[PDB]
Design a binder for this molecule. Structure first.
Ligand SMILES: CCCCCCCC/C=C/CCCCCCCC(=O)OC[C@H](O)CO
Ligand SMILES: CCCCCCCC/C=C\CCCCCCCC(=O)OC[C@H](O)CO
Lengths: 204, 121
């Protein structure tokens, strides 16, 4: 079938592009957690490290490049171009209690102890908790001027379609990745709290 | 990009055993999954057994649990399906399917030609 994972990825990319364009065209990153964007850039770097190694397709290599370039550009806009609007005093999450336990968890709990599997397991675990600095920022201030409704919609459609993908592959193909599913549920629950804080604190 | 060849099928008695093999050829990817399907005459295709490129994870359809065994052999680019205590309902054309588990690889999805398995009553 492979329709839910594709539309899920395209919805994920749309969210990334919307945020990058929002920061660029509004000339501000007010309300954005630079630490979460740094974690997302690290997710794509560790997952797509076999970019120039391992050529499979031109859609495959270019899409990996699009995600990396957009994630690095968003980090560039937050910490270099429009750093005057970066609320560092509110982006106070100590990401050491994320990277270090996620790193230890990837060495402990994985499907196979090999450098490529550990690296993939790291990026899976990290992506599930990468939004935490953003969550703690909005919970602290009640604000997210740069976070738009369409940005959150495509993030939510990305999580919903991945959920459909898990169910479809399990029932029709017998496939299930317990690590990816458990981490994906954690990520989806965290995104729902992300959506809950924005609707309750930022909107009204 | 990848060609798959299945062998090991044929005719066997009820209660007999057969081992299918899926030989992979072409250019590999680092993380993949391989699934056995079967399509009995007049029925829809259904998954039978599933395996990944590494780890101890396996999965078997309800109707073949306890009777079938899927296993790996990376030294040969081969995955086996051991089918023990075969019943006439297992008569079908069996297909192996390899999928790239990496991101953005929606069409790295390849199928064998199929092998006939018939179980006499
Ligand atoms: C602060 C740190 C936050 C970290 C947040 C991480 C969230 C995702 C966690 C997933 C746990 C894994 C659950 C599934 C475990 C399956 C293990 C398994 O099947 O292991 C096979 C093993 O290789 C046989 O030896
Ligand atoms: C166990 C094999 C299952 C399928 C593997 C597909 C890739 C095979 C491609 C090239 C052979 C060199 C490696």
């Amino acid at each position: 079938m492979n329709i839910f994972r594709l539309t899920g990825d395209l919805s994920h990319l749309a969210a990334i592009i919307i945020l990058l364009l929002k920061i660029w065209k509004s000339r501000s990153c007010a309300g954005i957690s630079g630490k979460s964007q740094l974690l997302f850039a690290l997710v794509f770097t560790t997952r797509y490290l076999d970019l120039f190694t391992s050529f499979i397709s031109l859609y495959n290599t270019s899409m990996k490049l699009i995600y990396i370039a957009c994630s690095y550009a968003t980090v560039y806009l937050i910490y270099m171009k429009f750093k005057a609007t970066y609320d560092g005093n509110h982006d106070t999450f100590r990401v050491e209690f994320l990277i270090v336990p996620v790193g230890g968890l990837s060495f402990l709990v994985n499907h196979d102890f090999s450098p490529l599997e550990i690296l993939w397991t790291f990026s899976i675990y990290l992506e599930s908790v990468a939004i935490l600095p953003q969550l703690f920022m909005i919970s602290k201030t009640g604000e997210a001027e740069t976070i738009t409704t369409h940005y959150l919609f495509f993030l939510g459609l990305y999580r919903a379609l991945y959920l459909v993908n898990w169910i479809w592959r399990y029932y029709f193909e017998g496939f299930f990745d317990l690590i990816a599913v458990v981490a994906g549920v954690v990520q989806t629950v965290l995104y729902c709290d992300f959506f809950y804080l924005y609707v309750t604190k930022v909107l009204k | 990009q990848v060609q798959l060849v299945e062998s090991g099928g044929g005719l066997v008695q009820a209660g007999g055993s057969l081992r299918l093999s899926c030989a992979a050829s072409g250019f590999p990817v680092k993380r993949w999954s391989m699934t056995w399907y079967r399509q009995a005459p007049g029925k829809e295709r259904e998954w039978v057994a599933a395996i990944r490129s590494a780890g101890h994870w396996t999965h078997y359809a309800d109707s073949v649990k306890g009777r079938f065994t899927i296993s790996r052999d990376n030294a040969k680019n081969t995955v086996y399906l051991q089918m023990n205590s075969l019943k006439p309902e297992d008569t079908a054309v069996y297909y192996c399917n390899v999928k790239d588990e990496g991101d953005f690889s929606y069409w790295y999805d390849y199928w064998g030609q199929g092998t006939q398995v018939t179980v006499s009553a």
